[PDB]
């Protein structure tokens, strides 16, 4: 069994209510990884055990260039640990906040790699349901890596629906803000919101009051900068169609509709999956312990441990080499 003391704990990359993510070094190999450490006490209290099991199961059963890879899933008496390959390039949220806006060419690169990832998950009957800038990381080469599969739903084939009110408030599709069920097209709405942010430098709808936010998502008409290209306006308008039936990617062919849109005219999609598209930005990391593309808010904090049977989480533990 793998344990806490098999790793050195170097720098805090993320922190929140569920737990934290730390850059670690595996003592045996000397190799670096990102370890998401979640408190079982919190997961049980919030009644989110099913989501933690789903995340591990999706990570175990997925392999794609633009999805994060699980090395070890292990647990202690009160903690759940995901050991994952370290994306040194940081979040897309970090980079877009720094640069304010991307060019249409750079957004097209990131958009294509996300579409490739979403086609993969959808062909595997998985709906991701949490596309956003914080969940999109960059690897050392500058390629996209989707992280955090906690809100995934499995077994969702052509036209199957979901009931859980979940996601992130700012990225919720209009149909999720209505009663009853919704389809896998919510992922293409999410793609639309991130694409909108990359090219327009803001969320298409924002208010800190969720009441006002959800009214904007349901009722408000999106706007575009005058100088945005016609194909970019058409793509965003297609992805952000409030009716999922009339949304780009909402038809039976799914990602095909999005891939065949005139905005991606210049893209060969077999080259996308083959990592043959040239990244417009290459992370300037000097070492492996270099965390320049993460917030000082987190990386400046001193690493510490928390002072607090069959408290086991079944169907969680895993090794990439054993399976």
């Amino acid at each position: 069994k793998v344990t806490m003391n098999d790793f050195d704990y170097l720098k805090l990359l993320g922190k929140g209510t569920f737990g934290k993510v730390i850059l670690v070094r595996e003592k045996a190999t000397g190799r670096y990884y990102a370890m998401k450490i979640l408190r079982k006490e919190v997961i049980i209290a919030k009644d989110e055990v099913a989501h933690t099991v789903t995340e591990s199961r999706v990570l175990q059963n997925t392999r794609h260039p633009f999805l994060t890879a699980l090395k070890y899933a292990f647990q202690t008496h009160d903690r759940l640990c995901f050991v994952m390959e370290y994306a040194n390039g940081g979040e897309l949220f970090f980079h877009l906040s720094r640069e304010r806006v991307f060019t249409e060419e750079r957004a097209r690169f990131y958009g294509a790699e996300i579409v490739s990832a979403l086609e993969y998950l959808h062909s595997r009957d998985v709906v991701y349901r949490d596309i956003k800038l914080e969940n999109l990381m960059l690897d050392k080469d500058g390629h996209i890596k989707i992280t955090d599969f906690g809100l995934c739903k499995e077994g969702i084939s052509d036209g199957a629906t979901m009931k859980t009110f979940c996601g992130t408030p700012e990225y919720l599709a209009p149909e999720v803000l209505e009663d009853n069920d919704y389809g896998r097209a919510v992922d293409w709405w999410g793609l639309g919101v991130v694409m909108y942010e990359m090219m327009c430098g803001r969320l298409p709808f924002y208010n800190q009051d969720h009441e006002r936010l959800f009214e904007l998502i349901l009722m408000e008409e999106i706007r575009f900068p005058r100088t945005l290209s016609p194909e970019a306006k058409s793509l965003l308008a297609g992805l952000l169609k409030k009716d999922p039936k009339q949304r780009l990617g909402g038809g039976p062919s799914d990602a095909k509709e999005v891939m065949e849109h005139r905005f991606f005219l210049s893209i060969n999609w077999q080259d996308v999956v083959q990592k043959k598209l040239l990244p417009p930005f290459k992370p300037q990391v000097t070492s492996e312990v270099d965390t320049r593309y993460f917030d000082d808010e987190f990386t400046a904090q001193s690493i510490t441990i928390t002072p607090p049977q069959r408290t086991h989480f079944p169907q969680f533990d895993y090794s990439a080499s054993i399976r």
């Binding site: 209510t17 979940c166 992130t168 408030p169």
Partner: peptide
């Protein structure tokens, strides 16, 4: 630059 968002469920 918007504030960090948080995921949620039910």
């Amino acid at each position: 630059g918007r504030p960090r968002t948080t995921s949620f469920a039910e």
